[PDB]
Design a protein around this ligand. Structure first.
Ligand SMILES: NC(=O)c1ccc[n+]([C@@H]2O[C@H](COP(=O)([O-])OP(=O)(O)OC[C@H]3O[C@@H](n4cnc5c(N)ncnc54)[C@H](OP(=O)(O)O)[C@@H]3O)[C@@H](O)[C@H]2O)c1
Ligand SMILES: O=C(O)c1cccc(CSc2cccs2)c1
Ligand SMILES: [Co+2]
Length: 159
């Protein structure tokens, strides 16, 4: 099982300036629940976006995808191809935009948090992957984050 997990604005923006223009504690909790105990695969830029304090993410096989053969990710596994990272029953790809696009053919699940924020796309933004017609989704109920933004969960799946 390869799954993708991300949060996006209604515009599809997932990242800007190397970070994320929101923070939902409820989404972080759902992220930890979904990924705990499994392999997480992330691009080098996303590993850069994690503070040194919190990486590697606890209780998970942290894998970083990089073309730099000498890149050091303390506490993580650095691989040069995505296939190297899929040696486990459950692999969760956790960002960023490049690695989502790279991993989509392998994926049968997308856990998508839609954040009700009006965020026009800018040059340089990281964007969520386009899901074609093979994907079957369950649109969720709008929820209120204590951060003040409304959010909902899409759980997409395909055979
Ligand atoms: N849920 C969310 O909203 C969410 C989740 C995660 C991240 N983000 C955001 O997404 C943004 C970063 O995403 P990104 O698209 O800019 O960069 P990224 O996808 O996180 O990582 C890109 C890097 O991955 C490596 N890479 C990419 N394709 C590769 C391939 N085919 N083979 C080997 N290595 C490859 C390269 O690392 P080298 O350059 O070292 O080779 C490339 O620079 C940040 O703003 C982050 O905060 C958002
Ligand atoms: O654990 C924390 O305290 C913490 C606070 C802020 C941000 C993060 C990164 S989790 C993530 C970011 C992109 C893909 S997965 C972690
Ligand atoms: Co699990």
């Amino acid at each position: 099982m390869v799954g993708l997990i991300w949060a996006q604005a209604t515009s599809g923006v997932i990242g800007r300036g190397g970070d994320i223009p929101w923070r939902l504690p409820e989404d972080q909790a759902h992220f930890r629940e979904i990924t705990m105990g499994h392999t997480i695969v992330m691009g080098r830029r996303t590993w850069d976006s994690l503070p040194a304090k919190v990486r590697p993410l606890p209780g998970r096989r942290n894998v970083v995808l990089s073309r730099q053969a000498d890149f050091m990710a303390s506490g993580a596994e650095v691989v040069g191809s995505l296939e190297e990272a899929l040696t486990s029953p459950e692999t969760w790809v956790i960002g960023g935009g490049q690695v989502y696009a790279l991993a989509l053919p392998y994926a049968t699940r997308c856990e998508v948090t839609e954040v009700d924020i009006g965020l026009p796309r800018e040059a340089g933004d990281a964007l969520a992957p386009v899901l074609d017609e093979t994907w079957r989704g369950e649109t969720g109920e709008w929820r209120f984050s204590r951060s003040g933004l409304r959010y909902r969960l899409y759980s997409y799946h395909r055979s």
